[PDB]
Design an enzyme around this catalytic site. Sequence first.
Site: not given
Length: 242
Positions: A45, A94, A185, A227
């Site tokens: 994504s 997302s 992300t 992350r």
Amino acid sequence: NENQFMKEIFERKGLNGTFVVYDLKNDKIDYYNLDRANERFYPASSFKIFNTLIGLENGIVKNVDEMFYYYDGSKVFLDSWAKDSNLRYAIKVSQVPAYKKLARELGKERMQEGLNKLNYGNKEIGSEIDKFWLEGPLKISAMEQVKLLNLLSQSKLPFKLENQEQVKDITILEKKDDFILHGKTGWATDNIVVPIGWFVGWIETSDNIYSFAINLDISDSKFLPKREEIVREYFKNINVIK
Ligand SMILES: [Cl-]
Ligand SMILES: [Mg+2]
Ligand SMILES: [Mg+2]
């Protein structure tokens, strides 16, 4: 030379991955795992940044605030996706079905022209117009993402200024007096043995722009927070997040 602080955080957390930061003012890169920094992976994504730019450039929507995706009660993985949306909302959550609709409306020819104008990774679409960024064949490296984001953050890509501006605005994550963090992300889980977690973006300060990409081997959704944790830990070390 690997950045030694990045090396320590990766070793402490026991994670396999890479991290690149480009410091515009100093024209230099700080990195962990150079060979993986140049290895191309499915962008997952993280591709929504650029899918949005190509959609705007083609006039698929008037702007990121125009209603575009119309929900129909169909199955969605996250409950936040079970509603009508514009692209601004869609990127923030997302919302894959909204971006699959975007891809399909663009079509192969216009999508290819977009990837080619960006020189985006390997530029491969294959034969799956709404899957190519999530399961192959498209791949991009951390170093390639950083180069693109450095340009985007300065409206230096070959796209309309107001479309680049829109993509910057929708990607705002944290705005403070001394910095503004933009990013996206992603998690590549399909057609791969070891899934890859991404977090890419940039941080603008009063006199610099730090463009960044991290990817990590992440097999369990429980470790996806790492992350952004690693990225924030590095930017706190260098007093950017402050
Ligand atoms: Cl959500
Ligand atoms: Mg419309
Ligand atoms: Mg500027």
